[PDB]
Amino acid sequence: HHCHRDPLPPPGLTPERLHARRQLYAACAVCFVFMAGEVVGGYLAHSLAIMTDAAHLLADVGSMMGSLFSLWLSTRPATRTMTFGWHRSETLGALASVVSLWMVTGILLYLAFVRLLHSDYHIEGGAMLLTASIAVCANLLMAFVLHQAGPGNTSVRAAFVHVLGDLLQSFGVLAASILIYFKPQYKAADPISTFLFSICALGSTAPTLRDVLRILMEGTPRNVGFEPVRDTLLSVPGVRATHELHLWALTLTYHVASAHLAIDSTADPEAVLAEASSRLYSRFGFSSCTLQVEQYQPEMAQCLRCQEPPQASDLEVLFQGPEFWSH
Amino acid sequence: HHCHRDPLPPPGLTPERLHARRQLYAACAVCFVFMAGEVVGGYLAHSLAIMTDAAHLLADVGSMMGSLFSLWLSTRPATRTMTFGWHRSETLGALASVVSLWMVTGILLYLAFVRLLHSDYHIEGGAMLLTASIAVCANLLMAFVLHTSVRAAFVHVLGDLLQSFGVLAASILIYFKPQYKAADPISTFLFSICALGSTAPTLRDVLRILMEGTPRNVGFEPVRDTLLSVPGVRATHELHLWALTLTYHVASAHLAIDSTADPEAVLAEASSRLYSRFGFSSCTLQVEQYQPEMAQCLRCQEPPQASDLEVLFQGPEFWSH
Numbered sequence: 001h002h003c004h005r006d007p008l009p010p011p012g013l014t015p016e017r018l019h020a021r022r023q024l025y026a027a028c029a030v031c032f033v034f035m036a037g038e039v040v041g042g043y044l045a046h047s048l049a050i051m052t053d054a055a056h057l058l059a060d061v062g063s064m065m066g067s068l069f070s071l072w073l074s075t076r077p078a079t080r081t082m083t084f085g086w087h088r089s090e091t092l093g094a095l096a097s098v099v100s101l102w103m104v105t106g107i108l109l110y111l112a113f114v115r116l117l118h119s120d121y122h123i124e125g126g127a128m129l130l131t132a133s134i135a136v137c138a139n140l141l142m143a144f145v146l147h148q149a150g151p152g153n154t155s156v157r158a159a160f161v162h163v164l165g166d167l168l169q170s171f172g173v174l175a176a177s178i179l180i181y182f183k184p185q186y187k188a189a190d191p192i193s194t195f196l197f198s199i200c201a202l203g204s205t206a207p208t209l210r211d212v213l214r215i216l217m218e219g220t221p222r223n224v225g226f227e228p229v230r231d232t233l234l235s236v237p238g239v240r241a242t243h244e245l246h247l248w249a250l251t252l253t254y255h256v257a258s259a260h261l262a263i264d265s266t267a268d269p270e271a272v273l274a275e276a277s278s279r280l281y282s283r284f285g286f287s288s289c290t291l292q293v294e295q296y297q298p299e300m301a302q303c304l305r306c307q308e309p310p311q312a313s314d315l316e317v318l319f320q321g322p323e324f325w326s327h
Numbered sequence: 328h329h330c331h332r333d334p335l336p337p338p339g340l341t342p343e344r345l346h347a348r349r350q351l352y353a354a355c356a357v358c359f360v361f362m363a364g365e366v367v368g369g370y371l372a373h374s375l376a377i378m379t380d381a382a383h384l385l386a387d388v389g390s391m392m393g394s395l396f397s398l399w400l401s402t403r404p405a406t407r408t409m410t411f412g413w414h415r416s417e418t419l420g421a422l423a424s425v426v427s428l429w430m431v432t433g434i435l436l437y438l439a440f441v442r443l444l445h446s447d448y449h450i451e452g453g454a455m456l457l458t459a460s461i462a463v464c465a466n467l468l469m470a471f472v473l474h475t476s477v478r479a480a481f482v483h484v485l486g487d488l489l490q491s492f493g494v495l496a497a498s499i500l501i502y503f504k505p506q507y508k509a510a511d512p513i514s515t516f517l518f519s520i521c522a523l524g525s526t527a528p529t530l531r532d533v534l535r536i537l538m539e540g541t542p543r544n545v546g547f548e549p550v551r552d553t554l555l556s557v558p559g560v561r562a563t564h565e566l567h568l569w570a571l572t573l574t575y576h577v578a579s580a581h582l583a584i585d586s587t588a589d590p591e592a593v594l595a596e597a598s599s600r601l602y603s604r605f606g607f608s609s610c611t612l613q614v615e616q617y618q619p620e621m622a623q624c625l626r627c628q629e630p631p632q633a634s635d636l637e638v639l640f641q642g643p644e645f646w647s648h
């Protein structure tokens with residue numbers, strides 16, 4: 001046919017999409033209510049380790065909100081001001097969740113630093129122990145529910161690992177609470193625990209921001225490489241040297257490509273165009289590929305704007321920057 | 328030429344860029360010194376209007392740093408993983424500045440609400456008056472030094488000069504009558520609301536640019552009409568035009584041509600018309616035979632005339648289900 005060959009038609013209200021959104025807000029509601037209970041307990045206990053656990057629960061709630069808004073907004077069609085669509089809402093929500101986690105972790109880190117230096121605080125061991133045990137039981141209940149509700153095919157399995165990690169962190173906080181309750185004169189255990197767990201949370205959120213910032217710079221997607229795309233385009237019969245090969249990603253799974261193709265004077269543009277588009281779709285699954293077909297016009301051999309970028313890496317290409325810094 | 332007519336290949340380093348480099352360093356150093364003075368004064372006096380002034384200076388310094396890093400990055404060429412270049416550093420720096428402003432002003436609102444509720448804080452009137460007077464004097468000195476980016480700097484300095492006259496008025500009122508201690512939280516509240524109202528439009532523009540949205544200056548209808556005006560075109564579909572920054576615009580579209588039209592002629596005419604009329608920094612358009620099956624095909628139909636709010640209002644049916 002035409003550029004619609006083997007195209008996946010995206011509907012609005014997919015029943016699988018409805019199931020996903022249903023389980024998503026169920027998990028979100030459970031996380032929010034248990035976060036509320038746990039933060040009330042932490043405010044009662046005047047501690048900060050369970051405050052770090054509540055911050056982690058807040059991060060989980062924010063991530064679920066970001067996923068839910070993205071899921072809803074993906075159903076809406078592309079408009080005259082959002083011609084690509086509302087896909088990048090997922091990336092923006094991920095960045096917002098990371099920023100919120102950074103803010104809360106920084107606030108808690110500053111509070112822990114103040115508590116460590118001033119060392120003027122009292123901790124209610126009776127309340128802290130009860131609320132930490134409640135959190136541990138909550139994580140165990142969530143894990144048991146997820147295992148029982150498993151074998152949505154991959155969502156439950158993906159959530160199970162995170163529940164296990166939260167359970168391990170809850171065991172850490174519970175051990176800190178035991179140490180504080182049995183020996184109240186070790187009251188500095190709570191700031192140390194919250195400091196270490198905030199550092200761990202920042203380390204865990206470090207890699208999920210690199211991908212978001214790489215996407216939000218119109219950068220090449222991690223999965224798809226420039227070299228395979230260029231080789232695939234050049235391997236199409238009748239194709240000479242190409243230029244202006246722009247390919248980027250709207251999200252982790254939505255990849256868009258664009259290129260200029262220079263063909264021989266004896267090659268039919270339609271056939272080579274269709275072959276290149278089909279090859280790109282089959283090999284890489286680009287969700288949108290609008291490539292331009294031109295005659296060779298040998299004058300581009302001397303054109304500086306038609307030269308492909310060098311194989312230098314991002315870290316390497318920025319090492320000549322200090323020349324501008326020095327000046 | 329072929330497709331790069333009027334290439335405009337900007338040099339990596341230009342003397343104007345070095346001049347902007349020197350100007351930005353001077354401004355950033357002055358603003359950082361003024362930040363140091365303001366924060367020391369506020370910490371000494373245990374006030375909060377000085378903290379709001381320091382927050383605005385933090386926003387200004389963040390804007391300076393973002394603009395300077397963007398200027399540095401614009402020099403660097405396109406990389407095999409950054410094929411579009413480092414252009415969107417402008418947008419990311421603006422977003423970072425706005426986010427930092429929002430976080431700092433949220434902390435300040437929290438502190439102001441706590442101070443208003445507890446109503447127990449001993450603030451030294453003399454020290455806070457001294458730092459407010461120093462801030463006003465420094466802002467007037469910068470205005471006098473300032474006597475393009477120069478006009479924008481002058482109007483921003485005037486705005487901040489009124490911003491600091493607010494602090495000076497609050498300071499003289501609290502110093503003349505120590506009883507009116509509660510004027511500081513009100514001043515901080517009003518000042519922060521003004522800052523939020525000022526910083527909302529830039530956040531909206533940055534979010535529109537990041538979401539691959541159509542740039543405000545360029546309209547979908549003029550581009551569609553221009554692409555349909557060239558002879559030999561009957562179906563423009565999958566038009567995708569977005570913007571890396573406020574000034575960098577990228578466009579991409581199909582062009583369905585009939586069997587009687589030369590693809591290169593219409594391609595060159597459309598590219599020239601787009602570059603001349605809208606100034607697109609990169610236009611990559613695809614030419615195809617009309618293939619009348621496109622008349623009944625589904626996703627090669629133009630999106631309907633509807634605003635972003637209008638289309639989103641049909642969304643609420645999703646949640647109920």
Ligand SMILES: CCCCCCCCCCC(CCCCCCCCCC)(CO[C@@H]1O[C@H](CO)[C@@H](O[C@H]2O[C@H](CO)[C@@H](O)[C@H](O)[C@H]2O)[C@H](O)[C@H]1O)CO[C@@H]1O[C@H](CO)[C@@H](O[C@H]2O[C@H](CO)[C@@H](O)[C@H](O)[C@H]2O)[C@H](O)[C@H]1O
Pocket residue numbers: 020023024026027030031060063064067070071090142145146149155156158159160161162163208
């Ligand atoms: C009624 C029961 C069913 C409920 C199931 C619904 C839950 C779905 C969310 C699971 C979740 C919530 C955490 C659950 C806490 C409590 C939940 C349950 C408690 C209440 C009963 C935790 O998922 C975990 O998050 C961790 C954070 O990375 C991470 O861990 C791992 O990564 C480490 C490196 O990162 C590494 O070391 C190691 O590989 C792991 O450690 C993994 O992402 C994952 O294990 C969110 O993370 C998921 O991550 C996916 C890609 O990120 C993404 O999935 C999709 O979402 C939409 C779906 O269609 C849809 O838009 C998309 O397909 C997609 O975007 C979403 O972001 C989010 O869904």
Ligand SMILES: CCCCCCCCCCC(CCCCCCCCCC)(CO[C@@H]1O[C@H](CO)[C@@H](O[C@H]2O[C@H](CO)[C@@H](O)[C@H](O)[C@H]2O)[C@H](O)[C@H]1O)CO[C@@H]1O[C@H](CO)[C@@H](O[C@H]2O[C@H](CO)[C@@H](O)[C@H](O)[C@H]2O)[C@H](O)[C@H]1O
Pocket residue numbers: 347350351353354357358387390394397398417469472473475476477478479480481482483484486574
């Ligand atoms: C020793 C000499 C130093 C001279 C300083 C030169 C620095 C120039 C920066 C001035 C600045 C900070 C101002 C802080 C003042 C400094 C205080 C102390 C300094 C004195 C020691 C003004 O900041 C803007 O000013 C606008 C006008 O005030 C105003 O916007 C609103 O208010 C108006 C009503 O006021 C009203 O019309 C309207 O509602 C709005 O318009 C806002 O204040 C604010 O957005 C920076 O932002 C400006 O905006 C540009 C995009 O950000 C930016 O250009 C960039 O693009 C270039 C090409 O793409 C490229 O080259 C670079 O990417 C970069 O340049 C410029 O940098 C600058 O033009």
Ligand SMILES: CC(C)CCC[C@@H](C)[C@H]1CC[C@H]2[C@@H]3CC=C4C[C@@H](OC(=O)CCC(=O)O)CC[C@]4(C)[C@H]3CC[C@]12C
Pocket residue numbers: 062065066069070073081089092093096531534535538540635636
């Ligand atoms: C803690 C949780 C609740 C956060 C959820 C994630 C958000 C950061 C996401 C959810 C949906 C996203 C929004 C979806 C739609 C738009 C519209 C878009 O605005 C326009 O196109 C302007 C239209 C106009 O003003 O006419 C700007 C980005 C924005 C606000 C997105 C920015 C990021 C948002 C707010």
Ligand SMILES: CC(C)CCC[C@@H](C)[C@H]1CC[C@H]2[C@@H]3CC=C4C[C@@H](OC(=O)CCC(=O)O)CC[C@]4(C)[C@H]3CC[C@]12C
Pocket residue numbers: 210213214217219314388389390392393396408416419420423424427
């Ligand atoms: C003093 C503070 C409060 C002011 C704000 C700090 C700025 C100097 C920061 C804010 C956001 C930063 C930008 C955010 C993201 C990026 C992407 C980053 O691109 C990458 O190479 C990452 C992705 C990849 O490796 O592919 C380059 C630096 C840059 C422009 C950052 C430069 C430094 C900026 C402007």
Ligand SMILES: [Zn+2]
Pocket residue numbers: 003564565581615627
């Ligand atoms: Zn097409």
Ligand SMILES: [Zn+2]
Pocket residue numbers: 056057060162163166
């Ligand atoms: Zn979790």
Ligand SMILES: [Zn+2]
Pocket residue numbers: 300303304305306329330331
């Ligand atoms: Zn060329």
Ligand SMILES: [Zn+2]
Pocket residue numbers: 243244260294329330
């Ligand atoms: Zn070309």
Ligand SMILES: [Zn+2]
Pocket residue numbers: 383384387483487
């Ligand atoms: Zn200012």
Ligand SMILES: [Zn+2]
Pocket residue numbers: 002004620621624625626627
């Ligand atoms: Zn079609």
